[PDB]
Amino acid sequence: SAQAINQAVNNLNERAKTLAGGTTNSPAYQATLLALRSVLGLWNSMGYAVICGGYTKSPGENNQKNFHYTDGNGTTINCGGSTNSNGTHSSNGTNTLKADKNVSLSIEQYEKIHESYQILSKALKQAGLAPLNSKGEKLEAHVTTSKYQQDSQTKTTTSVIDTTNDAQNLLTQAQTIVNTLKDYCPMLIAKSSAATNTPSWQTAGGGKNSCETFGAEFSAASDMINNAQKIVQETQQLSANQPKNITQPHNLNLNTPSSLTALAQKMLKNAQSQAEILKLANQVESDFNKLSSGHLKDYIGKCDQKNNWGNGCAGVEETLTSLKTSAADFNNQTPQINQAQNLANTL
């Protein structure tokens, strides 16, 4: 009957709008956010130890660049230099040897990580993640670096990037950070014989290859982003297939066997998109558990001269809880969606 069909349509559409447009109540949004915060947490946890500044074309370059971070305390990462045995800074360090896979990042590769990190961080701070069915809003991200001048001074530059807080843009930034590490596998700095405290994974003696130390972690973070991107794509497929209620229920010229079969198949596409989104959202939770169960187990989920390098400081545990709570709400509504499919299938 038309009463029953309109009920099933209203169930689908109400559930879809929460899923596509909700924040706190949408596991799609919470999964996407979890992936973004996880990548920020990854970089806050181990990014400081990444060796950078290997030369690209020529060792005559003698290139150095400094990259600026702010918690509210500020820190600075040098790429290219080293420290002399007496403690003074040397302009000849990692830049004396060639940048490539399993060695170090180039200055160009590091500045891409750094920029993506500042965009992602500042977007989430200034605007939050936009709803997944939204265009998002424009915002300005600031990226601060410095360079050494002829003999004397250090010149600091603050760049302004016009960017947005939509999921697709932010997932792209996260993907840049993860793929740079996973594809170029830079070496990590060892503990000595800008972090105050030393995490357990950063041992004295020999340095470790980042893909050896964090192979499982990088793969988990990469899968989180890829599944989040698919959530975003399914959410737009959901926003396309929005079935209409039957008006004029008794009018068989308006409501034909053709138009009602098209409606029924639109209802099924909506429901199948919803199911796939929730499955992806559960896979993101599974991948977060992979990410947070190895070397980063006592680090990624926590936050406390002084700086927060070595800890995640990204609110991942809070988001995980909100993912679980919202996912359970949608899972409890599965019976009213199964009957809505069974209602559509008979047509």
Partner 1 sequence: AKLTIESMPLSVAEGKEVLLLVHNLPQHLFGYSWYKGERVDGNSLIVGYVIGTQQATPGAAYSGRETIYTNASLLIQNVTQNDIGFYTLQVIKSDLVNEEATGQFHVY
Which spans of this chain sit near partner 1 (rule: CB under 8 A)?
A: 51, 55, 58-62, 82-85, 90, 92-98, 102-103, 187, 189-193, 205-207, 209
Quick one: what does residue 318 bind among partner 1, Ca ion, none, with the CB cut-off 5 to 8 Å set by partner type? none
By the 8 A CB rule, do 280 and 227 touch? yes
| Half-sphere exposure (Cβ direction) of 58: Cα atoms closer than 13 Å | 3
**Angle ∠(234,238,244) on CA atoms, nearest 5:** 170
Binder of residue 92, out of partner 1, Ca ion, none (CB less than 5 to 8 A by kind): partner 1
Angle 157-158-164 from CA coordinates, rounded to 5°: 150
Question: In angstroms, what is the minimal distance from the CB of 42 to partner 1?
Answer: 22
Task: Calculate helix-pair angle for 257-291, 316-332, nearest 10 degrees.
Answer: 150
Q: Would you say 60 or 257 has its CB closer to partner 1?
A: 60
Please, which residue, 189 or 260, has the CB nearer to partner 1?
189
Residue 76 contacts which entry, partner 1, Ca ion, none (Cβ below 5-8 A, type-dependent): none
Q: Of these partners, Ca ion, partner 1, none, which one is at the site of residue 193 (CB under 5 to 8 Å by kind)?
A: partner 1
Nearer to Ca ion, 44 or 104 (CB): 44
Q: Which does 303 bind (CB under 5 to 8 A by kind): Ca ion, partner 1, none?
A: none
Task: Determine phi and psi for 228, rounding to 5 degrees.
Answer: -60, -45
How many other C-beta atoms can be found within 10 angstroms of the C-beta atom of residue 332? 9
Least separation in angstroms between residue 109's CB and partner 1 is 16
Nearer Cβ to partner 1 (209/282)? 209
Tell me the C-alpha distance between 9 and 17, whole Å: 12
What's the closest the beta carbon of residue 93 comes to partner 1, in angstroms? 6
Kind and range of the H or E element at 79? strand 74-79
Footprint of Ca ion on this chain (CB under 5 A)?
Answer: 44, 308
